[PDB]
């Protein structure tokens, strides 16, 4: 599980939704909710500068790092989106950041903030349908446009995404979460794999 | 909302890019050839 | 996608409290603090 | 500029509404900053129960510092608006390249009822970093209560409840989390044949 003792994933969800007259569909591109990583191996692919991964690993706390590999499911809108859910132990404010990469550097950055609800002795968080970016949405189309898988996995070679999770009071870096994507065969759905990150 | 988007003012031609990598190339080394466990490479 | 807006979940009642505070009533008027004279004249 | 420490300074701030009808256009200004007078001070002692006083409220901010970054806005609102969009446009200059992060407090009571968190990278223009806040939607809670104070017949019950309204806004660089402008803003509604006019005051804790 993507978790330290004090904070936690949920869910997180990225989709598309649909509405035609009266028919609904919602399609899932991710849907998450431990073997290792030396992060040394992919310090390259994220940005390098102040604030960077290895910065921020260095920072800790390194039981924080977490390092996806995913599938995304492309057989398949009106709206492009992710919901997340958290808890937390600890009533802090919670700011989630996320960088879009390609070639290792940011292309787009998006930040959201979630106060606490108190439920069941424990501080919940929910990021309700984030709309992605058009960067990302055109991505998906263009991708999706693409003859053949394996064109699309090579487009995948060069492209990241970051998810830096923090408490806003202190700054702590409560969780954070790299991704890297292959896209799903065409009769299978998305899965994918959760690496913890350490140096050897 | 609940959200700021930071979008740089070249994404679109930075879009473009990932797919002239492969389509029109002019170097980063694939996750294939880095020390990784091998379930990386495949789907459960 | 340009801001982050947080909303307390009584801000209704909340706006209702402010007219309320006047109009159906310890906060102290700003004319009895120590304040310079220009304060309460408008250029 | 007034508004301004050695590093940073506010260049504009207009807060107004817009209406379009048959592609014709109307702007209405609520408030506008930016042989200037010299500045008064006010002790921020007297203010300090009008703004949320917590942990990283008003007091704990000002202790912080620095001090000469703290001013206060006594603004005469303009409602005479004889709206399809309701925002704020800001300006603001640098020394240094920081990533500007500006909270808005709205506050009733001396509570915060809505936050806004808005951030800009910058832009390096004639040898300084300009950062620009453009077309800032106004929340909900601030349409319907300028709405609802202009449904008031008269000037002085407007006034009045306004005692107990105020805005604190908070600019920080977000590396350091360190602040570099903090403006209070406290309210009366102009006279109708006046526009909106306003003084700055510089806080100190005498």
């Not at chain 1, 899932?28 to 390098?48: A, C, N, S, Y």
């Not at chain 1, 995913?70 to 600890?90: I, P």
């Not at chain 1, 990021?127 to 996995?153: A, D, G, T, V």
Request: aromatic residues 12%; hydrophobic residues 35%; neutral net charge.
């Amino acid at each position: 599980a993507i978790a330290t003792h004090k904070f936690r994933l949920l869910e997180f969800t990225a989709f598309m939704e649909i509405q035609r007259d009266e028919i609904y569909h919602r399609h899932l591109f991710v849907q998450l909710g431990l073997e290792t990583v030396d992060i040394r191996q992919i310090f390259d692919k994220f940005p390098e500068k102040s604030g960077g991964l290895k910065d921020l690993y260095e920072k800790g706390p390194q039981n924080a790092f977490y390092l996806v590999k995913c599938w995304a499911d492309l057989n398949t809108g009106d709206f492009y989106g992710v919901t997340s859910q958290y808890e937390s132990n600890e009533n802090v404010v919670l700011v989630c950041s996320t960088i879009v990469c390609s070639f290792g550097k940011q292309v787009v950055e998006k930040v959201e903030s979630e106060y606490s609800r108190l439920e069941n002795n424990r501080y919940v968080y929910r990021i309700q349908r984030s709309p992605m970016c058009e960067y990302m949405i055109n991505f998906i189309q263009k991708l999706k446009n693409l003859p053949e898988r394996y064109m699309m996995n090579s487009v995948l070679e060069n492209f990241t995404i970051l998810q830096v999770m923090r408490a806003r009071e202190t700054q702590e870096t409560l969780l954070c979460i790299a991704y890297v994507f292959e896209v799903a065969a065409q009769n299978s759905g998305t899965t994918h794999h959760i690496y913890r990150l350490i140096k050897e | 909302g609940h959200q700021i988007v930071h979008v740089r003012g070249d994404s679109e031609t930075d879009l473009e890019a990932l797919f002239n990598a492969v389509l029109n190339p002019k170097q980063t080394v694939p996750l294939r050839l880095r020390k990784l466990p091998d379930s990386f490479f495949k789907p459960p």
